Amino acid sequence: HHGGLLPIVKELIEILFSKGFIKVLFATETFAMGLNLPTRTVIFSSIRKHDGNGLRELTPGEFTQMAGRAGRRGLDSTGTVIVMAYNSPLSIATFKEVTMGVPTRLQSQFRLTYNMILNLLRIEALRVEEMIKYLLPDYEKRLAVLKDTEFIDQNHNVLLKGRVACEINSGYELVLTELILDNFLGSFEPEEIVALLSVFVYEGKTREEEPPIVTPRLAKGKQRIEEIYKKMLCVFNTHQIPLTQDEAEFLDRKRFAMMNVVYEWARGLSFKEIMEMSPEAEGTVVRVITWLDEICREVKTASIIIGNSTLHMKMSRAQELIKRDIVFAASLYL
RNA sequence: UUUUUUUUUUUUUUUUUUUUUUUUUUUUUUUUUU
Numbered sequence: 437h438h439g440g441l442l443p444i445v446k447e448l449i450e451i452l453f454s455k456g457f458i459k460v461l462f463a464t465e466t467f468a469m470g471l472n473l474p475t476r477t478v479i480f481s482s483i484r485k486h487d488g489n490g491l492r493e494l495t496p497g498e499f500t501q502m503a504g505r506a507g508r509r510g511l512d513s514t515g516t517v518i519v520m521a522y523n524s525p526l527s528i529a530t531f532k533e534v535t536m537g538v539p540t541r542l543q544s545q546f547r548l549t550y551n552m553i554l555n556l557l558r559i560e561a562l563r564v565e566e567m568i569k570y571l572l573p574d575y576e577k578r579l580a581v582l583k584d585t586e587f588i589d590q591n592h593n594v595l596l597k598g599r600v601a602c603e604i605n606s607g608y609e610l611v612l613t614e615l616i617l618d619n620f621l622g623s624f625e626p627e628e629i630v631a632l633l634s635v636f637v638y639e640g641k642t643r644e645e646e647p648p649i650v651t652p653r654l655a656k657g658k659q660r661i662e663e664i665y666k667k668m669l670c671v672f673n674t675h676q677i678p679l680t681q682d683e684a685e686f687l688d689r690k691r692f693a694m695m696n697v698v699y700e701w702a703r704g705l706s707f708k709e710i711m712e713m714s715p716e717a718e719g720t721v722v723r724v725i726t727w728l729d730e731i732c733r734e735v736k737t738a739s740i741i742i743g744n745s746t747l748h749m750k751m752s753r754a755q756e757l758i759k760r761d762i763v764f765a766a767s768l769y770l
Numbered sequence: 771u772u773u774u775u776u777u778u779u780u781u782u783u784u785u786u787u788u789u790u791u792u793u794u795u796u797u798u799u800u801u802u803u804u
Contacts, residue, residue, distance in 0.1 A: 439772090439773085439774095464772070464773090465772055465773070466772090466773080469773095485771075485772055486771035486772065487771075487772055487773070488771075488772080488773080490771095491771085605776090606776080641771070723774090723775075726775055726776080727774095727775075727776075729775090729776075729777075730775090730776050730777075733776090733777065
């Protein structure tokens, strides 16, 4: 049970588990959250996990959430939990801290984005500074970047470039806006346009070799995107803005590995032949196509704002080319 | 290396014909070739 499976397979496994047909199950963390399917034995492979930035010992809250799904009322007299030890003793202080201790409620750092700033500048009145207090040094630095690349003027009035970025919510407002206004995407076909846009959707956490040959084109598109991203990255560092892990290690990861998978999906090819060459499981491929529906909608909106009807019809064709029957399969619970 | 599915609004037709407008006049015998 993990996130790389198709929804139908995952719900099939859940239903079979609920009927007492599965004895041994290897599960990820998502199984514990919700998913009211208790069991009798819970075994921890390790008490540490890698969450984005490095390894970290399990918090007491997660341990309580996972271990609590071990005793079913009526059929069991006690709930057993097994912690493994692999030819090496484990420290007792860490064990006591993980197992015994008051859980703490989570908190968020309230990340500030450029889309939020651009949306807040269009609101009549609403002095922004007096609301941020109830982050101030960061807000001034971000305003200087927006004025440098001509998103706003000297009086902080939103221009045409800023209006487009206000409609892009997913991940990267400034880079996408620069790409659209640079007459990019005007030479490619609908199949090739959606193939290049997957870099903003696929995070490239794999380490497998990318396809050595893609096409004579779609390689110039790779270079153009990387140059534009590199130029935007220099502006960010000029104003001394702290960067997130995702934005810092963007070109370091292999985020272009799914172009071939998306390219053949839109061109028309049986999904069995696609999986013979894709570097990700079936569950991951369907997620990428699902996330590419929102990107096409945003680019269609930007075309109306700037008045380019050629780009509007290209994006309409792309949406119809990435729809298949398997992504609309009915749930087995219904 | 866990974790991440986003998609705005409208209902069943104004009433009475063809006309559709400018610069000033005359006088007495057939037919053909000349």
